[PDB]
């Protein structure tokens, strides 16, 4: 097995014995296997395999995403980070000098996950509605990306919201849109179309891609703030 660096820095490429590829990023918390993944131990460092089927963004890079604004040292106002393995991955890929505040609505989700993210002291989770941005405002500064994997009807609204409120000048936000949550009725592409309508009404949309097959009617959104 060997490990070397992604085009995305913080990022990794594992190549397993037989010559096939997965992406990985380097454990911020040596010794921790929480979500039983798979680690690759590699000199002297742990890698933690990125699953693209227990993560939309995982799936998203596999699937070639060529814009991430996640970067080493970042902060992100992560809407939704109960979800997956993601926030893992990206607590790991901001490091010690990145902050990510995770939002969640429910009480019983943000008291399941902090034994989970207990160690990832980078994570702070925050009990707030993503609806009312606004809320949270003491708790929260300005950051350089948005993430949001929030399932409703409103959800490029909540990402505008959000970043009226917190998002840095020419920072960044990632969406990842379940179609059929917006609307069951229309086409997932015509519900894709329509988010991208609205998301432009404030943003520039820099990509878009689906991430079949490891999601079904899913894309993911990557826009910029003017």
Do not use: C
């Not at 096939?20 to 918390?29: D, F, G, P, R």
């Amino acid at each position: 097995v060997e490990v070397k660096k992604h085009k995305f820095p913080g990022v990794y490429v594992v190549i397993d014995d037989d010559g096939s590829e997965k992406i990985a990023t380097k454990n911020l918390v040596p010794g921790q296997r929480v979500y039983g993944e798979r680690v690759i131990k590699w000199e002297g460092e742990e890698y933690r395999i990125w699953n693209p089927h227990r993560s939309k963004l995982g799936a998203a890079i596999v699937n070639g995403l060529k814009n991430f604004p996640i970067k080493p040292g970042k902060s992100v106002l992560y809407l939704g980070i109960a979800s997956g393995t993601t926030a893992s991955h990206v607590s790991d890929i901001v490091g010690w000098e990145g902050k990510i505040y995770g939002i969640e609505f429910s009480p019983r989700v943000l008291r399941e996950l902090v034994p989970i993210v207990e160690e990832r002291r980078n994570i702070i989770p925050i009990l707030g509605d993503a609806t009312k941005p606004e809320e949270y405002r003491a708790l929260v500064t300005k950051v350089d990306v948005i993430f949001e994997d929030v399932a409703q009807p409103t959800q490029a609204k909540i990402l505008i919201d959000n970043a009226k409120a917190y998002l840095k000048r020419g920072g960044y936000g990632m969406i990842a849109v379940k179609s059929r949550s917006i609307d069951v009725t229309k086409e997932p592409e015509q519900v894709f179309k329509e988010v991208e309508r609205l998301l432009s009404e404030y943003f520039e949309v820099i990509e878009r891609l689906n991430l079949e097959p490891y999601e079904k009617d899913h894309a993911l959104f990557v826009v910029r703030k003017p």
